[PDB]
């Protein structure tokens, strides 16, 4: 008997515990709000035929007026946002930003750092384990759409067990050819192309006939509570920008292809609820980072 698991779900590293309180949460909300005004100031500059709208936006974000002989960096808030993002990813990252600096930057705009007033859908499909008997090959490829390739070289039909965890809300399975799937201690129905199932129900048994390989595609949806200012497209771009800039370059940590995989992998840890709150705050910080760095490249 062999077992297989998703690659992105292996060994989630611990996340940081700093910059989670109310003042730090409001700093991230202010940074997101002010960085958004920076991007919109470009369109205002085009319409107004002048750089005054951009100068006003940068002055509020950086406490200093822009210069022509200096490369625009963002000043204290840019430095604070960058260092705070580093601390969120790993517990080994230092917490360099002082509290006093965080409170001063959090007073720039009026926001509430409530990160539980909305939700988002995360599409990473968790396959905790797939148990197959001898003379059966199982390969799991993919993270957003997981394709499971199954081959039965044995004499008779085999029973393969799926375990999708206890966190995902729904999972939809679509097979290359019609197949049979049922819960444990349940009878099997007629072969169908598509199955919709709740992972909380229990481990699922799929009957593998002997012959050509059977491939099953898995798509899952998970609901995680996020602030109302959350935007998945901006968060995903911020994740790639931060990884390129080396903000995640620190020893004894894991690397993920997308923010979708990062948050779901942390949610499936030993105590994944503790890390979901920090990961969401990292998402808002990354959304602020993508806007800030696209307006002020460096």
């Amino acid at each position: 008997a062999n077992r297989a698991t998703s690659a992105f779900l292996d060994n989630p590293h611990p996340v940081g515990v700093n910059y989670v309180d109310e003042g730090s949460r409001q700093f991230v909300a202010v940074a997101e709000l002010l960085a958004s005004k920076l991007i919109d100031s470009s369109r205002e500059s085009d319409e107004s035929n002048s750089d005054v709208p951009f100068v006003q936006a940068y002055s509020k974000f950086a406490d200093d007026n822009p210069r022509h002989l200096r490369v625009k960096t963002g000043g204290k808030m840019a430095n604070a946002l960058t260092n705070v993002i580093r601390s969120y990813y790993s517990i080994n990252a230092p917490a360099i930003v002082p509290q006093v600096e965080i409170d001063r930057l959090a007073s720039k705009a009026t926001v509430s750092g409530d990160m539980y007033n909305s939700y988002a859908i995360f599409n990473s499909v968790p396959i905790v384990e797939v148990l197959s008997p001898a003379r059966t090959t199982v390969s799991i490829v993919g993270s957003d759409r997981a394709d499971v390739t199954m081959l039965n070289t044995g004499a008779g039909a085999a029973n393969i067990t799926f375990n999708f965890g206890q966190i995902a809300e729904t999972v939809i399975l679509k097979g290359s050819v019609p197949f049979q799937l049922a819960r444990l201690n349940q009878p099997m129905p007629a072969a169908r192309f598509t199955y919709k199932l709740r992972p909380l129900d229990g481990p699922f048994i799929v009957v593998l006939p002997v012959g050509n390989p059977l491939v099953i595609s898995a798509t899952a949806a998970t609901r995680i509570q996020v602030p109302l200012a959350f935007n998945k497209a901006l968060v995903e771009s911020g994740f790639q920008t931060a990884m390129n800039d080396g903000l995640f370059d620190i020893q004894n940590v894991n690397y993920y292809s997308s923010f979708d995989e990062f948050i779901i992998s942390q949610y499936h840890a030993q105590d994944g609820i503790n890390r979901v709150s920090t990961c969401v705050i990292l998402g808002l910080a990354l959304q602020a980072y993508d806007q800030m760095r696209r307006a002020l490249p460096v």
């Binding site: 989670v20 003042g23 917490a95 959090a106 007073s107 009026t110 609820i273």
Partner: protein, 249 residues
């Protein structure tokens, strides 16, 4: 709450000289640290929120009956607001000030064998913030100069680069260094942002928020000293004077 409100090296050191050691210890048995627990956080979740108990929370915890435990309780009081449960220490030691325990040989406590690596590890330093780390480094520096272990203190800082970057710069025997220092060591204070009456998930964050909201209530209460209004009512001994300096410094 009073200890966490000190924002400068002068105020923090002055407070430690005035307060006795009995404030650092607690007479409530509490629970044990380093234990995985399920706590109830109903404003956010219906299930039980996992967390881990530590010595840095503001709740009293049982502590070891040795010099190592006594020092951990003192640093915990400075960086968290509450100490541990080490009873039957003796009235001779409990009357003396926290500063005297840290930097005077007359007390009788022997702290030379203390190692800063395990103390920082036990007093979980990966979970502290910048202000908490600075206060701990102050206590380490005071202890090191008490037993003549300045070289060991430097080597420990050189091993850990982030600690060196935020390490306060003052000589424990000189008062001019304390005056010149401009580090911000305040963990509670009047907030520029919007502070609400809401819970936080972690044990450390929830207890810290309780101290923060408690300081606001104390700041606006009748126990606070408004210098701009009643500076002529304080006695001459405790009035703020530039000539004032710590005893023996």
């Amino acid at each position: 709450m009073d200890v966490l409100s000190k924002g400068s090296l002068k105020e923090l050191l002055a407070h430690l000289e005035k307060t006795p050691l009995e404030e650092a210890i607690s007479y409530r048995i509490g629970t044990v640290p380093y234990q995985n627990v399920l706590i109830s956080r109903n404003e956010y979740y219906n299930q039980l929120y996992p967390d881990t108990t530590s010595l840095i929370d503001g709740v009293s915890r049982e502590g070891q009956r040795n010099v190592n435990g006594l020092i951990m309780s003192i640093i915990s009081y400075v960086v968290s607001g509450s100490g541990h449960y080490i009873p039957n220490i003796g009235f001779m030691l409990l009357r003396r000030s926290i500063l005297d325990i840290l930097t005077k040989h007359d007390t009788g406590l022997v702290t030379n064998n203390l190692n800063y690596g395990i103390i920082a590890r036990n007093l979980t330093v990966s979970k502290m913030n910048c202000e908490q780390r600075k206060r701990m480094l102050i206590c380490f520096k005071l202890l090191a100069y008490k037993d003549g272990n300045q070289n060991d203190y430097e080597i420990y800082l050189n091993q850990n680069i982030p600690l060196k970057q935020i390490a306060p710069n003052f000589i424990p025997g000189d008062m001019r260094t304390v005056i010149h220092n401009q580090d911000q060591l305040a963990i509670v204070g009047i907030p520029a942002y919007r502070l609400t009456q809401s819970t936080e998930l972690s044990i450390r964050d929830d207890n810290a928020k309780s101290y923060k909201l408690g300081y606001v209530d104390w700041y606006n209460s009748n126990s606070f000293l408004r210098e701009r209004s009643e500076f002529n009512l304080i006695r001459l001994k405790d009035r703020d004077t530039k000539y004032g300096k710590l005893n023996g410094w």
